[PDB]
């Protein structure tokens, strides 16, 4: 390895070399991403009052 | 194993290979899901307050 830089100097016969590169082409893909721990939604109220709805939902 | 990526490079004779793949087709299914620890119900009262 070239340090911790995501590079990798690999050094062998050409038969091994063109076999390992075909495997690595298959079993090597970027990691998945986390989704999020927080989301937002916005509701445009039509009949109710947004401040009374908030007080109702909070028990105040 | 290819790290912890849910992949598995398995490498043997073809007889063993077509037998292990038939078993794994049987005893390998996705895990079940938890239900939830919280539920909501809404009641529209008619007579009471």
């Amino acid at each position: 390895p070239v340090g911790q830089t995501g590079q990798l100097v690999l050094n062998g016969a050409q038969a091994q070399l063109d076999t390992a590169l075909a495997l690595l082409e298959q079993v090597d893909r970027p990691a998945p991403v986390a989704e999020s721990r927080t989301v937002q939604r916005v509701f445009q109220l039509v009949n109710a009052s947004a401040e009374e709805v908030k007080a109702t939902l909070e028990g105040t | 194993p290819v790290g912890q990526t849910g992949q598995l490079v398995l490498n043997g004779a073809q007889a063993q290979l077509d037998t292990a793949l038939a078993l794994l087709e049987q005893v390998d299914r996705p895990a079940p899901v938890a239900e939830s620890r919280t539920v909501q119900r809404v009641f529209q009262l008619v007579n009471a307050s």
């Binding site: 109710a48 009374e52 109702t56 939902l57 028990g59 | 239900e35 939830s36 620890r37 919280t38 539920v39 909501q40 119900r41 809404v42 009641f43 529209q44 009262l45 008619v46 307050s49």
Partner: peptide, 29 residues
């Protein structure tokens, strides 16, 4: 704990929020 209860005066709605066992108790009341 105990189930959370939310009362809306405008719509006369009762909202119970808790574990499935705590919610079935209010549902039968």
């Amino acid at each position: 704990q105990q189930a959370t209860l939310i009362a809306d005066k405008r719509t006369n709605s009762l909202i119970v929020r808790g574990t499935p066992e705590q919610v079935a108790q209010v549902a039968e009341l």
